[PDB]
């Protein structure tokens, strides 16, 4: 019952999308918190050798100037889905002359995701976090290989998803500021990280309504972690 995306288990489950979801646990922890001030996005680098360029590891990519992205799982599937997101939001801007809402970009990415056995392949073994600011305000959206897209005030994907999520429920609350959200996310990441936290072990990215520029953290990661 688990050899295809076309077979249903006797208890009713598609025992192929579940396996794709299990592939997320084989990624790296990614933490995102949505606040009124903005949305943060922290990710473990998990570099394998010092020789590889840190910029080569694309864990936080940019769908557009107004929404960030976080990945966990397959690099190839995620890059395929990301090329969909950038192209889709650019097409939406071209046709409607406006910035796409993060919910709509997540909808398009999911619409691509709902095609593993819904055409006429395999589910994309990657979970996607979409953080950005829109008309309704700052918003964080998370989607899974099944294409189920939902918004989360603060969500953690990849490895340590259960532990990071559980430790995030206790610390997070609605009236949170961006600096405190960054500090809390870094604290959770350091707690759930296998290696000691430093500048090169993580990348950070924040999205604010008024500073839709600077969708990264270059060399000032050292300042933030040193105040932990």
């Amino acid at each position: 019952y688990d050899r295809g995306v076309n077979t249903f288990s006797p208890e009713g489950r598609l025992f192929q999308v579940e396996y794709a979801i299990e592939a997320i646990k084989l990624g790296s922890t990614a933490i995102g918190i949505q606040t009124s001030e903005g949305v943060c996005l922290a990710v473990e680098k998990r570099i394998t050798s010092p020789l590889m360029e840190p910029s080569s590891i694309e864990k936080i990519v940019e769908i557009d100037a107004h929404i960030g992205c976080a990945m966990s799982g397959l690099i190839k599937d995620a890059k395929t889905l990301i090329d969909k997101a950038r192209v889709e939001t650019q097409n939406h801007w071209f046709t409607y002359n406006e910035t796409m809402t993060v919910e709509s970009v997540t909808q398009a990415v999911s619409n691509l995701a709902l095609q593993f056995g819904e055409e006429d392949s395999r589910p994309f073994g990657v979970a996607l976090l979409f953080g950005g600011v829109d008309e309704k305000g700052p918003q964080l959206f998370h989607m899974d290989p099944s294409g189920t897209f939902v918004q989360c005030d603060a969500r953690a994907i990849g490895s340590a998803s259960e532990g990071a999520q559980s430790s995030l429920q206790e610390v997070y609350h609605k009236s949170m500021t961006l600096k405190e959200a960054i500090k809390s996310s870094l604290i959770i990441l350091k707690q759930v990280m296998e290696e000691k936290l430093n500048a090169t072990n993580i990348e950070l990215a924040t999205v604010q309504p008024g500073q839709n520029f600077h969708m990264f953290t270059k060399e000032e990661l050292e300042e933030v972690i040193k105040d932990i």
Binding site: N6, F8, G12, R13, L114, Q151, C152
Partner: protein, 238 residues
């Protein structure tokens, strides 16, 4: 046994095991209660949240100004069927310039979902749809089970632990016709609460209501918008 791997094969007892398994996908989703009066068609859905601090999933979808659904099954199949409905409704409004009657939409859904259950290359649509609509022939409530079989339901509830709602609806079946908006919505809320476990109770975040009426289009009430129907609900006996 061995005849439960493909829809194309027939079991010795004259059953198709894949659809019987597809039937089970509906019960995986949360319970959703749909009931119609002589003047309104309202379906109430139990929304679930994957985590404490994650927003509850949308259970009631918008198909047209006079047809709306609640989904109980697979999310991907639900989205695909909703997109198919929206495209069909737009085409009908474009070509006949008339709000397409809900029965024809349900028949088209049956025709489309009957395709996977006869040709290999696609799995059955593992989603259950409570189709609520208002055409010129009065309010309606349909349920499209994944077996491509649809029934004209006066009131129905599918999903996880949805049976306790069905026995409540069948018990208050007679009085559903001569009900106004608020009383019918309260009956639906009572059924949905019957689906809930003893510890859980309907709060403003886990319940969603969508109503289509004589002069009212299909409108989604969530968060604060469900509260006007949530207030006045009688507390569950305990």
């Amino acid at each position: 046994n061995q005849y439960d791997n493909d829809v194309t094969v027939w079991s010795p007892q004259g059953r198709i095991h894949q659809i019987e398994y597809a039937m089970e996908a509906v019960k995986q989703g949360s319970a959703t209660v749909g009931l119609k009066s002589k003047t309104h068609a309202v379906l109430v859905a139990l929304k679930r949240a994957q985590s404490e601090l994650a927003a509850h999933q949308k259970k009631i979808l918008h198909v047209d100004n006079h047809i709306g659904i609640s989904i109980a099954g697979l999310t991907a199949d639900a989205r695909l069927l909703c997109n198919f409905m929206r495209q069909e409704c737009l085409d009908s409004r474009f070509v006949f310039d008339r709000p397409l009657p809900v029965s024809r939409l349900v028949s088209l859904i049956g025709s489309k979902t009957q395709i996977p259950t006869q040709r290999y290359g696609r799995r059955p649509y593992g989603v259950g749809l409570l189709i609520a609509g208002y055409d010129d022939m009065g309010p309606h409530i349909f349920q499209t089970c994944p077996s491509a079989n649809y029934f004209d339901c006066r009131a129905m509830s599918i999903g996880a632990r949805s049976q306790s709602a069905r026995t409540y609806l069948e018990r208050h079946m007679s009085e559903f016709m001569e009900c106004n908006l608020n009383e019918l919505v309260k009956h639906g809320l009572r059924a949905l609460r019957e689906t809930l476990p003893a510890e859980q109770d309907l709060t403003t975040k886990n319940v969603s209501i969508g109503i289509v009426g004589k002069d009212l289009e299909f409108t989604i009430y969530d968060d604060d918008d469900v509260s006007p129907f949530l207030e006045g609900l009688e507390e569950r006996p305990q």
